[PDB]
């Protein structure tokens, strides 16, 4: 039976880097913002 | 695919960029490049942020030839060589600018 | 402006709004994103056998063996 | 992907497009033409009314509505066939589709946004719809988190202050000073050389005249004195109808009103003096940031010399121990719409949108209730 | 229109137009290597 | 071997670092900011509240609460941002690697303790922590055993009696009238010359005023006949809006009142008297001794010209056939943290640490039985 095997799924890590307000999306979307910097990037990622 | 491109601009502590550089660098005495008013490899701002131009071990200046020797096996013309060199060089001066 | 020069070389390399419109503004980590995508994309249609090199020590030394 | 419109109903131009364009794919005036005669011919495929570039071209058999005034819109019908152009003709493409941004002037009518809201909910179907004020806009096109933004239109002028993105309400100005009364006062100063401009189909010829000669004085009565005694300063314009009129200090008169409101007989201070009394109403701590960041935006802003004059005139306003910049950048007369390419492209403003699953639920008082 | 930049802008520019550059030569190189491999040949399939 | 960190939490600053440093890591002002402001501009990696540096910078955005007035702790989901700021980002320290002492004035609430002790092991979770009064420190700072100290900050004032190492308990007094009620008894007077302070955004300008232009009078009231003949007596400074203000009859009339408090409709008298009555319920062995080591403390006794001020008064009240001496060295605004780092630095000291296993088997009190 395939319930036996138990999937380990890092989706959640690929959807915390790659989706949308992951951690790249909250990059791109700070390069455009006007005066954007490392640390209100590093704000974002505390406060998402 | 995934190339690092933003090595060719940016190097941490005693990085390189990529070895063509260092090679052509190397070859500044070889008449050919007389024109290319090359300079040691810490003269240009892309080489130089790294703090660390010579791989101990390694003749960039013999890495050259072998590169020279292969793009001939390839049939990569000498002119296209050039061409490829003259570029780069024109990358180098560009990066002081 | 570069598109003008003086040898063969130069034109040649930028040969084949627009896709390579956007791509000129495309970010680093945009482009790497895709180009992930492209590599998944390629490998998805195909099936995979895996290798795995390993570096046993840092002296280069014959049959010597780092466990750290 | 179903990115967002960009859509700045404005009042005079719409300027229309997708986000992530860096300018619109449509700029045309948001003019409704109607024919003033009884239409002669029989069989002819008749059209009864014009929207836009057609109103330009046909004025001559005409009658021009504005149906935005002082950014109010106020014929909903009228308001209706300009949107049915946008989507339908201009930018040719079916608006349940996908989410549109709006503009909007500062302190307006509540019933303003509520009646957008509904006809973009139930006529057009639009899935998703937000309003944004026209000066916030400005800020992320001219790269700043800290302004104040001089924001001035065909429809209306306004002041917005901005520190570090909190925007400061009771400071927001604003003025019915605009693009549209320094063009009927182009009029009202023209008939001093004996020239006459007095119908609907002949006003956009004035606002035309005005864009090409048009310059501000550093200083007035100075360059008053000098285009009264030399005509080395006088142009020469061509009429449509190949007549020829000629212009001298008359061409830097109309734009001294936005200085001067007492000239068109307002009370209101107009632009350098609204821009330090709203500067003034923040808070002390801020008013330096300020003092460095002013930005020009919006149309009204184009005349050559104004950046200058704003930063001389200001600093007769400011303290000696000050340093006073005007931003000025040459891209500014679509910088509205330009903010709103990068707002609504802001993965972070992703959450931000009214959904008509929202509005369906919640009924047209949702505006004020959600979004900003 | 035609508008000045900031040195940040400028030197991001000359640094983005170094790094497309370097790419694409990067990518001519790779095409005479593909010229010098390939043959007419119909390839039925292939192992990557 | 483990350090411990020396953190006088005072009032009105915060003073950190390690054991055995000579100045401290960190000095910021004991300071939680919140927005009032709108929030309007979307995506702007806004954060809910500031601590420190960070809430001054950003000061016209805010409100400004300091949680602590009169040495007393009001709100405890403020203060403990402080002590967070402290030690994870300022000093760059967890506090859960080694012990902590910390400070307090005298007099102050039983409670205030039993909070500290319970936030320090509860939720900081410290090793090992002590208290230790203020002005103790002052003495092994300024390299001596016996004393009477006034250690004068923001928010609270104190003497504290100590003959060779030994406490005089019955002959503490402490004094609220602090660096503080100077700045708001500054706003309470420069409302007279016109200028204008009510907001807590502008009250950070109002205590940099005090720090810089003002000094102490010999004598107030040939000064207050001096400031109708004088304008040398008037000093000027720039405000952040560029103002140039200027201010003459109060720089004595406010810095002053720590000499003497009738002004503001309060009984008790001033730091004069309560040094010398602080003397006057010391044991009668000991008064040479201690009119000979006054030790000035915290940064409240600055100001240039106070060491003659205090000379003056308590000679005026005590026989002058007694001798008064006042210890003000430069390094007075720190010496409460110095004097903690030399003290948690002794082999001999290490004994007196209550530690976590103390707390949990006895509860909060403990304070009460193995400190002061």
Partial sequence: PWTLIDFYDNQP???????????????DEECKMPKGTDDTWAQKLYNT | YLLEKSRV???????????????????????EFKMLRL?????????????????????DAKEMAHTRQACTLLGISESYQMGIFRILAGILHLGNV | VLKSSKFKMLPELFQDPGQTAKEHKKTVGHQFRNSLHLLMETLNATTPHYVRCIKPNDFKFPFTFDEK | ETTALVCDNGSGLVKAGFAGDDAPRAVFPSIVGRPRHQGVMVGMGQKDSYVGDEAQSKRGILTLKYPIEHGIITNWDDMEKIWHHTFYNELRVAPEEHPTLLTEAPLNPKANREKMTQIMFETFNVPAMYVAIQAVLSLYASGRTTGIVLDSGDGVTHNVPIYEGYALPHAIMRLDLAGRDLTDYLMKILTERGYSFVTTAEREIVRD????????????ENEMATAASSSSLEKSYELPDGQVITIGNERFRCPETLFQPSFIGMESAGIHETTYNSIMKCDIDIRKDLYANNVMSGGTTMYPGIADRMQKEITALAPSTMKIKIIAPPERKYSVWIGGSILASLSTFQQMWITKQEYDEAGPSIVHRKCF | YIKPISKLQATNARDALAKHIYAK?????????????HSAVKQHSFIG
């Avoid at chain 1, 890590?13 to 990059?27: H, T, V």
């Avoid at chain 2, 990085?15 to 090679?23: K, W």
């Avoid at chain 2, 942020?49 to 003749?59: L, N, T």
């Fill in chain 1, 13 to 27: 890590c690929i959807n915390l880097i790659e989706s949308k307000l992951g951690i790249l999306d909250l990059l």
């Fill in chain 2, 9 to 31: 601009v940016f190097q941490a502590e005693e990085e390189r960029n990529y070895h063509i550089f260092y090679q052509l660098c190397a070859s500044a005495k070889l008449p």
């Fill in chain 2, 39 to 59: 300079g040691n490899a810490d003269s240009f701002h892309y080489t130089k942020q790294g703090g660390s131009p010579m791989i101990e071990g390694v003749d």
């Fill in chain 4, 209 to 220: 005249i005005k864009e090409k000669l048009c310059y501000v004085a550093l200083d007035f």
């Fill in chain 5, 25 to 37: 030569l990067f990518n001519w190189i790779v095409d005479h290597v593909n010229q010098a491999l």
